[PDB]
Amino acid sequence: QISVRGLAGVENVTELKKNFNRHLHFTLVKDRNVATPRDYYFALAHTVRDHLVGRWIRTQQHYYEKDPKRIYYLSLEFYMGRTLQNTMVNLALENACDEATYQLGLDMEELEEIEEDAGLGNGGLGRLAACFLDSMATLGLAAYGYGIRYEFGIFNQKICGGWQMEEADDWLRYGNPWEKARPEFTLPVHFYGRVEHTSQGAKWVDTQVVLAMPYDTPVPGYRNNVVNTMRLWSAKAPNDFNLGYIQAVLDRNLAENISRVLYPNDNFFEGKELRLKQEYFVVAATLQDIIRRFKSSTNFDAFPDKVAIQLNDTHPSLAIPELMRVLVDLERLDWDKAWEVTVKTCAYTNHTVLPEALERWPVHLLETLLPRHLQIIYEINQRFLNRVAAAFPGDVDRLRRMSLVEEGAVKRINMAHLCIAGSHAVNGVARIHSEILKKTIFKDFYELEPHKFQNKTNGITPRRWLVLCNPGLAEIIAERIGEEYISDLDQLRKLLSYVDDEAFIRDVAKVKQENKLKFAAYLEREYKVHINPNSLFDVQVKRIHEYKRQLLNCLHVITLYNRIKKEPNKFVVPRTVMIGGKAAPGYHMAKMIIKLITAIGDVVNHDPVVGDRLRVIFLENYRVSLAEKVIPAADLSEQISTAGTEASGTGNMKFMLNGALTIGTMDGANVEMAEEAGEENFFIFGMRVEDVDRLDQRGYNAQEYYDRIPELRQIIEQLSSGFFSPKQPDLFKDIVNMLMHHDRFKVFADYEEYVKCQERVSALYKNPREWTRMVIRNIATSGKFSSDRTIAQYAREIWGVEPSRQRLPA
Ligand SMILES: *Cc1c(COP(=O)(O)O)cnc(C)c1O
Numbered sequence: 082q083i084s085v086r087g088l089a090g091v092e093n094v095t096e097l098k099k100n101f102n103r104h105l106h107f108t109l110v111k112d113r114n115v116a117t118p119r120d121y122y123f124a125l126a127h128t129v130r131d132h133l134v135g136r137w138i139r140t141q142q143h144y145y146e147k148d149p150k151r152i153y154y155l156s157l158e159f160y161m162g163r164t165l166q167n168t169m170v171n172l173a174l175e176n177a178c179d180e181a182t183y184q185l186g187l188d189m190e191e192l193e194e195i196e197e198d199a200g201l202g203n204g205g206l207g208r209l210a211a212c213f214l215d216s217m218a219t220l221g222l223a224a225y226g227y228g229i230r231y232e233f234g235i236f237n238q239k240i241c242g243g244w245q246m247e248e249a250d251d252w253l254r255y256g257n258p259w260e261k262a263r264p265e266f267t268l269p270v271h272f273y274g275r276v277e278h279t280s281q282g283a284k285w286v287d288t289q290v291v292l293a294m295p296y297d298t299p300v301p302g303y304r305n306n307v308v309n310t311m312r313l314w315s316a317k318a319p320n321d322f323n324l325g326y327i328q329a330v331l332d333r334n335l336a337e338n339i340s341r342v343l344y345p346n347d348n349f350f351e352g353k354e355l356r357l358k359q360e361y362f363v364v365a366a367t368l369q370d371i372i373r374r375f376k377s378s379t380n381f382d383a384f385p386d387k388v389a390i391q392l393n394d395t396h397p398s399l400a401i402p403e404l405m406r407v408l409v410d411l412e413r414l415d416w417d418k419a420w421e422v423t424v425k426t427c428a429y430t431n432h433t434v435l436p437e438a439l440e441r442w443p444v445h446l447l448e449t450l451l452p453r454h455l456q457i458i459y460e461i462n463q464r465f466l467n468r469v470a471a472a473f474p475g476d477v478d479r480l481r482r483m484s485l486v487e488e489g490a491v492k493r494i495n496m497a498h499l500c501i502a503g504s505h506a507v508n509g510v511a512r513i514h515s516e517i518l519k520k521t522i523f524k525d526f527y528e529l530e531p532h533k534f535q536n537k538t539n540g541i542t543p544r545r546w547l548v549l550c551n552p553g554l555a556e557i558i559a560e561r562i563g564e565e566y567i568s569d570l571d572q573l574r575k576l577l578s579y580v581d582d583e584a585f586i587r588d589v590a591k592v593k594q595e596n597k598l599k600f601a602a603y604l605e606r607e608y609k610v611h612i613n614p615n616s617l618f619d620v621q622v623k624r625i626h627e628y629k630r631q632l633l634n635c636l637h638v639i640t641l642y643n644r645i646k647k648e649p650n651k652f653v654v655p656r657t658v659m660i661g662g663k664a665a666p667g668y669h670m671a672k673m674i675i676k677l678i679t680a681i682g683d684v685v686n687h688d689p690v691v692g693d694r695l696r697v698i699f700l701e702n703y704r705v706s707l708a709e710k711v712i713p714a715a716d717l718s719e720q721i722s723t724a725g726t727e728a729s730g731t732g733n734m735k736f737m738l739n740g741a742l743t744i745g746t747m748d749g750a751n752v753e754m755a756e757e758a759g760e761e762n763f764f765i766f767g768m769r770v771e772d773v774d775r776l777d778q779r780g781y782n783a784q785e786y787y788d789r790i791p792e793l794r795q796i797i798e799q800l801s802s803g804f805f806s807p808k809q810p811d812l813f814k815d816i817v818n819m820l821m822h823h824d825r826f827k828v829f830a831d832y833e834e835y836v837k838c839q840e841r842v843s844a845l846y847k848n849p850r851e852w853t854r855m856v857i858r859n860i861a862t863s864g865k866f867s868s869d870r871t872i873a874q875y876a877r878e879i880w881g882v883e884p885s886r887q888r889l890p891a
Pocket residue numbers: 203204205208622623624703704705708729730731732733735
């Protein structure tokens with residue numbers, strides 16, 4: 082079919098077909114007369130899975146033999162999505178399987194749609210971890226992803242009456258063919274108990290035990306025969322647990338609830354005990370596994386030379402005191418030596434500066450759940466502050482500002498401070514974010530240990546985010562520059578010499594048009610909503626949050642609508658405005674924004690005068706699999722967070738790599754994207770970080786914008802009067818109130834420039850040729866945003882290991 086999808090050899094197509102039938106029969110226990118599409122999907126999944134095992138076994142045997150430094154990526158989230166196609170792509174089996182299933186009279190694409198998304202993440206943070214695993218495998222690093230095997234991942238979103246309804250993501254219902262339970266490696270995790278101080282050392286006793294059972298999932302590198310491992314822990318109650326009899330057995334649920342469900346909060350800290358248990362659970366089991374693997378390879382001096390632990394934000398921050406606990410209490414190392422090892426082993430990555438997202442655990446919680454860890458944290462704080470006091474004599478405020486322990490209503494432990502103190506490297510996820518860390522939130526820490534602070538701008542894997550989701554684009558690109566770019570995205574720059582190539586311009590635009598037609602079709606298939614494929618696809622997909630400002634997008638949509646109603650017979654570039662994303666269940670304002678979006682669509686989509694000139698659609702249940710479909714079909718990417726709030730963003734990179742132009746603020750990675758492509762090829766608008774600060778010093782008064790902008794005033798009055806909610810006139814009173822009196826994200830402040838910028842977008846879209854040429858300039862300079870580049874920097878500048886593009890014998 083198409084080049085980049087590999088060869089469809091005679092022998093291997095034949096082999097695939099027989100193994101497919103072999104699995105349908107022996108594995109699924111079905112025949113062609115009673116098999117359902119799902120059975121066929123599993124037969125294929127198992128057939129592909131078989132090609133992984135050989136490589137998986139030798140990759141691990143390889144690491145045992147060579148004993149390289151091991152990288153442990155600890156995260157509470159891994160947003161993997163579907164695994165079938167990704168596996169075929171990395172094993173160069175896509176065309177062969179496509180052919181084999183074709184000959185069996187089956188449509189492989191239909192079968193791929195049956196696989197459930199592995200949604201063990203909320204959004205960008207979990208997706209980053211998934212892209213990172215892909216890149217580490219592709220770069221030949223002996224890396225392991227460690228997390229929790231949630232029984233229920235991010236909830237499936239249903240839109241009822243325009244309101245978000247959540248329903249359990251029972252992703253394991255039909256089983257998971259990709260994982261391999263490893264019950265033989267089960268480890269005990271301790272909770273509660275008390276600390277006993279004996280002759281030689283302290284002892285943590287009278288604890289309640291929960292077993293951690295690991296499940297391994299293979300992570301194949303891109304065509305290098307490397308298959309790494311993602312190990313996810315599942316909670317299991319010991320058998321003597323609580324041992325009326327019946328009740329004791331039913332109460333096992335209490336212990337196993339630890340790995341039951343993913344907390345659905347994106348950029349928001351919820352200090353619940355269950356969450357703390359999850360954090361310790363993943364940390365405790367992982368560290369024991371790490372140490373056990375090390376002892377094989379008694380003197381932990383070399384521990385840092387053979388182990389690197391990366392903390393994905395503070396969620397797994399307990400790894401620092403847990404490592405100290407094990408080394409001091411169990412291995413009997415002196416404190417100072419244990420600390421040296423811990424710091425040299427741990428590295429911390431911060432992903433946000435939003436105050437409500439930072440973890441600050443109540444001391445009383447740690448006191449009851451992890452008594453020994455609290456003592457260790459106090460000791461760490463004591464020694465850390467002595468260092469601060471020695472470096473800044475007499476600066477008592479610095480002492481209280483840097484303390485890991487925060488005083489006040491209830492004493493809390495600042496996990497971020499803990500991470501900085503116990504790590505040899507701390508990094509932000511985009512240049513501007515890392516600078517903000519050094520200038521604001523972590524300024525005191527940067528002044529004490531400037532050497533620790535680094536930047537590692539995020540990235541996305543070009544395998545899933547280009548080859549897999551946009552084969553048509555990957556193909557026309559391969560046609561001109563070869564396939565090498567798939568694992569060396571910088572090579573896309575060569576496309577710059579085709580910016581004036583008429584054939585290429587035509588192909589780029591053709592691929593986009595095809596993606597839009599395919600998506601427009603999908604919308605009618607699974608959701609029954611008609612849209613015009615000739616319109617500009619204006620899309621904003623990401624979690625619903627005030628800082629991401631879906632509300633600013635909404636104001637623009639209403640502006641466009643009001644302008645059309647004012648001058649109906651005036652021409653305007655047709656637009657299909659698509660907004661999608663999930664709101665955390667307890668985030669009221671986020672849920673109201675979703676309702677506002679659907680309410681706007683209700684009015685706009687049924688107004689006869691508007692016609693097919695403007696359509697507002699809310700993409701339901703936005704997740705990884707849906708991102709793979711809508712991003713390749715997008716023309717305009719909305720990355721409009723208030724400057725200084727989106728640490729990096731990654732959706733922005735996906736859109737850039739897939740041929741969409743970007744309208745956004747100078748926030749997060751947007752700054753570097755504009756820098757790489759050139760500001761003239763980016764639709765930048767709004768306040769920069771400095772402008773936001775100037776406004777805060779002066780005091781943000783929304784009323785001022787309302788009084789000086791007639792169009793804005795009209796919108797607010799429409800919202801307040803019930804124009805978008807006839808039966809419930811004051812339905813959006815909370816939204817208006819917030820916008821007018823307590824908008825922490827200054828939506829009104831960027832309104833004018835945003836609308837103006839949006840006009841420049843429409844202007845360019847009217848010139849197909851020039852729009853496409855600008856698109857080419859974006860795609861051609863998106864190379865820096867490959868997670869391979871990001872991982873290579875982590876490897877060389879933090880973990881101290883060299884990436885390799887060497888194939889392993891398959
Ligand atoms: C890439 C991705 C994200 C992150 O998007 P941003 O716009 O950076 O917040 C969130 N959700 C899904 C499903 C993604 O694929």
